Amino acid sequence: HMGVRIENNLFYVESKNLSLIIENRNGYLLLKHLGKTIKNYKGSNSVYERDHAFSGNPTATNRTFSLDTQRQIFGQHGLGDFRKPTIQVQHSVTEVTDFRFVEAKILKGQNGPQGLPSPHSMDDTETLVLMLEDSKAQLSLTLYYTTFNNDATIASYSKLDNNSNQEVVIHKDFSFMADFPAADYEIVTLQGAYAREKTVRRQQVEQGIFSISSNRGASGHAQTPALLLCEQGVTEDAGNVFAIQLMYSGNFEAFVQKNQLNEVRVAIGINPENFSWKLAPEEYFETPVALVTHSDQGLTGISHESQNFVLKHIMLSEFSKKERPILINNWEATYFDFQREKLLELADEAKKVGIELFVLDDGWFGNRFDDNRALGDWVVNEEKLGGSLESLISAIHERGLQFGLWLEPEMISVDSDLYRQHPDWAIQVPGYEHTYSRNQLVLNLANPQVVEYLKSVLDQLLFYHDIDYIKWNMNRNITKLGNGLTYLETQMQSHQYMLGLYELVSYLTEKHSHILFESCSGGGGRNDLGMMRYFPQVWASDNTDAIARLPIQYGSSYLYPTISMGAHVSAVPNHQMGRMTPLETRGLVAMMGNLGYELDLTNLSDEEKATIANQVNLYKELRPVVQLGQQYRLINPDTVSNEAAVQFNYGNQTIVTYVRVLSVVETMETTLKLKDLDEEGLYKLQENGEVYSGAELMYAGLTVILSQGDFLSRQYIFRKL
Amino acid sequence: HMGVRIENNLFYVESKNLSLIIENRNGYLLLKHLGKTIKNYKGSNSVYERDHAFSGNPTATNRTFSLDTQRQIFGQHGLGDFRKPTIQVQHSVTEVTDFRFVEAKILKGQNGPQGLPSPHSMDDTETLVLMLEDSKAQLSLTLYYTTFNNDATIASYSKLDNNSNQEVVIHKDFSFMADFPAADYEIVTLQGAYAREKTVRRQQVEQGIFSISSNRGASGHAQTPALL
Amino acid sequence: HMGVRIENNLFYVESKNLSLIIENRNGYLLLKHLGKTIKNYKGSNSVYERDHAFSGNPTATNRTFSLDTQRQIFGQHGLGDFRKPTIQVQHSVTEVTDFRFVEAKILKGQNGPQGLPSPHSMDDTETLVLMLEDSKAQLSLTLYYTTFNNDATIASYSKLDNNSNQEVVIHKDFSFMADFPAADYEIVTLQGAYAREKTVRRQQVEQGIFSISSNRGASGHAQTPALLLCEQGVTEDAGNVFAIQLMYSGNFEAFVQKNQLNEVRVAIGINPENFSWKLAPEEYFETPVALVTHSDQGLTGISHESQNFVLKHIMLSEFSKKERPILINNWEATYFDFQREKLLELADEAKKVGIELFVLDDGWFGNRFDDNRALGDWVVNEEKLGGSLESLISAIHERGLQFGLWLEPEMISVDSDLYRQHPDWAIQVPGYEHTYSRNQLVLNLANPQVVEYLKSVLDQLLFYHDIDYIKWNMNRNITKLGNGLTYLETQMQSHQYMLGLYELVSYLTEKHSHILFESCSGGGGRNDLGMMRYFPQVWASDNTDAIARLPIQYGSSYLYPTISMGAHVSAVPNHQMGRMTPLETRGLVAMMGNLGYELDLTNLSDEEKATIANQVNLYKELRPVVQLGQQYRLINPDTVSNEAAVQFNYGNQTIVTYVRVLSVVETMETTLKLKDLDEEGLYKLQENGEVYSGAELMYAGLTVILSQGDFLSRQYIFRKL
Ligand SMILES: OC[C@H]1O[C@H](O[C@@H]2[C@@H](O)[C@@H](O)O[C@H](CO)[C@@H]2O)[C@H](O)[C@@H](O)[C@H]1O
Ligand SMILES: OC[C@H]1O[C@H](O[C@@H]2[C@@H](O)[C@@H](O)O[C@H](CO)[C@@H]2O)[C@H](O)[C@@H](O)[C@H]1O
Ligand SMILES: OC[C@H]1O[C@H](O[C@@H]2[C@@H](O)[C@@H](O)O[C@H](CO)[C@@H]2O)[C@H](O)[C@@H](O)[C@H]1O
């Protein structure tokens, strides 16, 4: 049985194959167990209470009880625990609180923080409600833990109520924390950089504090809101992993602290940097949702658990199991230099090769002839489009293609009518020059007038035009915070910006629910689970190099389903890397993702056109396997590997893609073994017609043969008989 | 020769076998070299200035100058550098400052922060005084770097003056910072515990942030104020 | 289905969950697969045949077939393969052979090399017989591979027949070889030293050749005839392991070679060093049996597979499931300084504490008052024993104890009547002084007169005396080889020594099958599967320190069952380490093995006596769990670990022993999780009466609490309800 149970002083939060067991000890909440299901928990792994030097106590006479040494589910500073705190509220002359458990409730079905992205499809869930109070400060903190009956994930968030007669200020308020017992641990995170997104990083947990964080106002290219605490020696196939993740797209921190006793604290939430939150009497603050996910089946186990939870409970139901259109995007194809003739000719070529959707990228609005002006001016450039957008769309529709359109609503150019009319709408500090980034500024979405304006302009665009798809961009990070009437309002504006964004995108995605919205932030600059609540695919990276895409796709699909992961076949030499790669390899690499095209089809040879038509035909066949199937990493593209290989299973279809980076000589061929087949199953390999048992493919494997050369690839396609 | 030298837009802080060479670039202070003595420094290891995506700029038209990518000796938040800041002062409705170099002085002999433990036997020392101002906020930040003639050590501290007509609040103010060029590095620290003090720890520098800290009101058994 | 199958040009050798699939390619035998079961093998992992530079060919015109690049099951030198060979026979002017497959047969039921220890209980086995011939040299090589229906092990050996009209000389003849595909591999071996036996070593496979070997004439303290080739990243719980082992107790080699293409060869057999073997026309040579064992369940998987195979098919049926007596041995207790009074008084004390068997150690024979004389003179010293051995034995029997006796049959002292009568019986070289070791010499057991003499003297000792147990010692290694009438006979004498030993011990153990024979060689100097065919327990180490015993027991039980592993509680300060350890810890450590006692019980306090009586009572209870149960390593004692923990399961009994080496301070308690329990099972912990689900014990685990101090231990005893 799954759900929530209250049994004497234990609370059991029971998801599928994952339990959190909390003990109420005289108002203090102790983490007894987080991990595989245990019923009738007795306490075999309880903390041994002893006098630990310099670890102090809530009472004078009992030296062996200390919040410095108890395992907890939230952290305070000032009561004897010196580990990093996760709740810290200023009230009167102090930022000491002492929240004590008073009452527990259980909810059933949907719930979550208002104004923030949270799980859906929650009918078969229960939520533990732990009501804590600080009687002196007259504050309440309420913790929520939600079970899921179909996934090894628990969701968490909290609400802080000010029940006092004075203003209070939240300084720290994370979404999840767990104290894990001293043991050897490794951590996996996804970091990297622009054009190197979601680089998989693994390291040993060491004494001290390790953290990843964004202070950019977006989660960022260089860190993902995820931290995987792993059993020493974890592999793809074996060992315990706990993934903590955050459904938030602004400033966040994830940290792991190893203290003086070798104990380990992990937490994730809103970054303390650039954050404070004023609460007037009777006001409350709810944190974004955190997730804790578990597998005992290594890193592939955690990928599957995380992907499944995302597909079922985050990504929009309307799209989570819907094959996504193969698109053409004109950006790398033309940049800003296009007009109607060029567009329809590209559309003609796209239709001939069987592409499904035509996306008009940057440059269609205002006087956007380059990237130095016009953001904020969402007026159609009818001169450039050679008539109305309506007439363009009709043209695209009549050629048999869906129509998509680029927006960047959060941004404003100094050189724009919007800025001329409302210069105060930009994020800025009185008496300081702007800081520029791609020669543009960020709109203050903490300003309700800004949100109202964007809802209006965009609702107008979407209702008056037959648009099938939106690409929602965001091309710089936030500087010069000073739009508040007070310092505290400025400290709130980064989170209020996010609330404004979510109000905006939840409104539009809900009001226009037939439209496929793809998120973007110079590629993967905001590829997190907050955005994926509303945008069921993401432009994974501006780097469209087939080879540079290998580690990027590795990371981008590590916790997120492949279906989310936009990938385009682009021109050579590649625009980012300056590299020639075979068209075959560009195709096979993009086909490990959500396939599209981004090159000038009108300038290709007849042969290159035929190749792309063949690629499109192939992917129409593989699309369900890739987008709806189960992903298995076989060879990981990292810093030292010269190879990449990824398998997908879906019913009677099994495919495997193999890529080799550098040509090798006098080196024995790799043996590549498949996973998760029926030993007794019979698998017919398309290329040679041979039938192999699943046992053979899994335990003997394929001798991988290639010619001489860099960046070569091949694909194996099997049908189970 | 050891001591402090000011030469066009370079400042040389020269201790025995250790130099800090700082460049004034239009009010921004750049760390050019920290390490073994170099005279007549030309800039072989200067940062190559290019357009780095999402690294923003103090002017609209120059995309290749960014405090996100320049090596510095103190860190601010809000001007395009997103690395962890080491000075952050709230004033009026903001905690954005933009301290710009205005003037350099050189002291000889003893000096240090009042009320805090500082080096003694300083007769053969010189101190570089880098006076920075935020004209809008009406704040001064003054950086001090002191040479020693008999040791490969440089000492540092700073003073922040409120020259405005309103209260201001310091939120962050570290004593030393250096941006080192991308390379492979390890770190050594002394941590441990009560009855296990100053345990020597060594690890690889990894992407992200590693820290040791005390919030105990004392430096503590489990971490020493040192990082190698 | 298991057994052997011949299907066109494939041969399938099918044990439980392990298959060897060999292809006959025009007389050459190719290793197609060794690993998990595959039926209907097609060849997905076949070698890709290409022209590899400097890899030559059996025909002029086909450059892509080369024995330098094909994966094989035996290795020759001179036909284009430059990997280390495993068969090399001199004939006429050459040591080039070219053995070609001619015919295959299948046997059922028992078979093995004559004169060498081989598996028993073989009714449900089949043996593939691969008959190879070199027509020019007129030699036959016949390879045997045997399946087992109840274990993931295949056994192998070969026979070489000289069918020519001239003498031939074998230079190399290993017992097993496999070419494994290029991949990342680690190897585990057991090495160490005297008083540090079976130290577990793990390392990466590197280009070049790694080997362990003995040239000592015994397998030796410092290397065990075992090599585990492991999947990169193997753990206790997960990953593929292939263990190759040799049932031989003389000179051996195991090697792993990584060649120029990254391919990996492994082999084990008689060491080429100190070996040559002359065959006259019509003579044949059979190699010792090698074993290849597989698990995909990590290192605990391989331990279980290896232990099970040993228990079922090597260790004597009469003893493999028989609880072994708790003994007292007087060696550390008295050394050579004893007589009848002392012996019976020790026997009295042993009986009071419930000990079962009394073993009389060195010094009872000839004029053996120290270790400088009398080896070879197996005459009872009736003066020292205060009457006949018969009268001593009766005395011991009447006190309720079984009687055991020390022998060292393979050795002779210069100062002995045996040496005075037959100086030529010693291993020696004409015209060279002896090399001495513990001031004794080795008997030439290659001399049939020596074997006849020992059979006679010992048969006499055993038939005329009511002995329940023998401790068979061997206290030096072999030097000064030169007893041959020719150089070639000398080159044969080390292997003939072993044949002589096995003839001797198979005879006596068979003719006196009620007697428990424990093997010994200054502790673990010859603790291998050759000896374990006849001697169902072994003195694991002269090091009886509780703490030094930790890594020793780790290694000694790594591939061999716990029941084999002699372990004695001894006096403090310990005689080897100069160390004080708690009597409790000495007890608990020895109780992880086959328990006995080796200290002067007559000199203990009343309290120390009561403690030992308590230990004996406890072990009488734990003995089936330890000796007959399943072993699970929980914390391994290695160079860096400060801890050791080992679990045993047997029906409704689960025990766990924990030892900490150095005292620690301000360090959080270890969390120790149990393995292989029923999640839903209820487990009652004896010490506190608490009942824990198996899920709790396995997934939460025990907080391990100890006082301050070095070398402390504790045991947890559970009963499943
Ligand atoms: O749910 C826990 C809190 O409930 C009460 O306040 C809530 C408030 O948080 C918000 O949900 O608005 C509703 C509307 O009725 C309630 O006022 C308590 O005041 C808090 O102390 C806390 O228990
Ligand atoms: O030294 C740099 C600063 O100097 C001036 O102020 C100092 C003040 O810091 C303190 O040292 O007290 C002395 C006493 O005269 C001076 O007032 C400037 O006001 C600062 O702006 C700054 O330049
Ligand atoms: O079993 C393979 C060999 O069989 C023949 O010789 C055997 C010999 O090895 C030994 O087993 O003694 C028996 C007794 O009859 C046989 O002679 C062949 O001579 C060998 O060539 C080889 O086939």
Ligand SMILES: OC[C@H]1O[C@H](O[C@@H]2[C@@H](O)[C@H](O)O[C@H](CO)[C@@H]2O)[C@H](O)[C@@H](O)[C@H]1O
């Ligand atoms: O402007 C259209 C373009 O926007 C985003 O990419 C850009 C990139 O082309 C430019 O070189 O740099 C900025 C940041 O400096 C952005 O990363 C989209 O990601 C891209 O797909 C395209 O739509």
Ligand SMILES: OC[C@H]1O[C@H](O[C@@H]2[C@@H](O)[C@H](O)O[C@H](CO)[C@@H]2O)[C@H](O)[C@@H](O)[C@H]1O
């Ligand atoms: O002599 C009896 C003794 O023989 C073996 O051990 C000895 C050891 O006591 C002595 O110190 O060294 C030699 C080698 O130099 C042997 O290792 C047995 O192993 C021991 O149990 C005892 O029976």
